[PDB]
């Protein structure tokens, strides 16, 4: 099939949770209290007490800022859609897709039953039984899925996620995460490697 | 052959398109120090290529073309026709049906 | 699953702008001087792990 490493079709970027950077096993980077979680780039969070999510998915404020700063110099002085000629096929905003859904609340819905696939019916009599073959059975009321709308709507929980299907995550070693020039300002800081950092 | 075998039923075989990769990636050896390429002045034996294992020429070229032009335009000479998917297949977007 | 490939021939093609010779011989003499070395940079420009 496709070979992402050779052709650029990267499709597992939504699977990262956090990344942390630590020089000399003590000097955390970016440090300097920069992010809302200063010692870690928290890419996404499964639960958000403080409200650090954005864009109506679960990606963080910190990460969304870093990606918009690194690709387009956008975060400081407000977010907007990047101009189309600077938003190529491998760019961030071109590929970023936030999503939300509702599911039956299996804990708080007291009348719930866990019907597994062989026992679910909907379109019985008019559909093949567990196969792309001839119709079987009789017409009957459907038992699945539970309704999430109307007056008889069932108690429900929200799920949130995002996809990013051709990007590869970036972290510029630049003092404000922006691209000011191809040789960054930290890259002509840290020549200082007389203590040679690990 | 039998009366019950009259009821056999068939399904079409799954579609499987085969062709060369985008920009012919994978055809030539790059960044692969067993099978390196050569460009040398015929007199003096020093290869000018000098490639490495931790380099990625194929991805580098794929990225370059997206910065130099519009990947949505196919071009048969270089077999350039970028990989995609139907966005309505990647994200189901189930609005039901107008019935 | 049965696929295979055979190469019958591989040829190298080159195309030349038909430059006036007094111009090309001038361009060569400028590009051979060590002040004018061509330089290039891999577009990805990274070490891969």
């Amino acid at each position: 099939g496709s070979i992402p490493y050779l052709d650029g079709t990267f499709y597992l970027n939504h699977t990262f949770k956090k990344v942390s950077i630590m020089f000399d096993s003590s000097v955390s980077w970016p440090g300097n209290d920069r992010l809302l979680t200063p010692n870690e780039f928290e890419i996404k969070r499964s639960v958000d007490g403080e409200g650090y999510n954005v864009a109506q998915c679960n990606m963080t404020k910190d990460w969304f800022l870093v990606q918009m700063l690194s690709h387009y110099n956008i975060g400081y002085q407000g977010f907007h859609v990047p101009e189309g000629y600077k938003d190529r096929m491998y760019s961030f905003f071109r590929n970023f897709q936030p999503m939300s859904r509702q599911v039956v609340d299996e804990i708080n819905y007291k009348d719930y039953k866990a019907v597994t696939l062989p026992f679910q019916h909907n379109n019985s009599g008019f559909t093949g039984y567990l196969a792309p073959t001839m119709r079987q059975g009789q017409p009957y009321p459907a038992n699945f899925p539970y309704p999430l709308i109307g007056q008889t709507a069932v108690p429900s929980v929200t799920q949130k996620k995002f996809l990013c299907d051709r990007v590869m995550w970036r972290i510029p070693f630049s003092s404000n995460f922006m691209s000011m020039g191809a040789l960054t300002d930290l890259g002509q800081n840290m020549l200082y490697a007389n203590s040679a950092h690990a | 052959s039998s009366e019950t075998n009259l009821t056999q039923q068939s399904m079409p075989n799954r579609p499987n398109y085969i062709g060369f990769r985008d920009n012919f990636v994978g055809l030539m050896y790059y960044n692969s120090t067993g099978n390196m390429g050569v460009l040398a002045g015929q007199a003096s034996q020093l290869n000018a290529v000098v490639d490495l294992q931790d380099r990625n020429t194929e991805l580098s070229y794929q990225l370059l073309l997206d910065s130099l032009g519009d990947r949505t335009r196919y071009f048969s000479m270089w077999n350039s026709a970028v990989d995609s998917y139907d966005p309505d297949v990647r994200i189901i977007e189930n609005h039901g049906v107008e019935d | 699953d049965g696929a295979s490939v055979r190469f019958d021939s591989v040829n190298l093609y080159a195309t030349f702008f038909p430059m006036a010779h007094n111009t090309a011989s001038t361009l060569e003499a400028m590009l051979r001087n060590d002040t004018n070395d061509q330089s290039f940079n891999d577009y990805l420009s990274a070490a891969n792990m």
Partner: peptide, 21 residues
């Protein structure tokens, strides 16, 4: 990739069309 071009051109023509000095 900080879109890694950086190249030589800064160029222009005569009262239409070029021979150099």
């Amino acid at each position: 990739d900080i879109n890694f071009a950086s190249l030589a051109p800064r160029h222009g023509t005569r009262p239409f069309m070029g021979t150099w000095n």
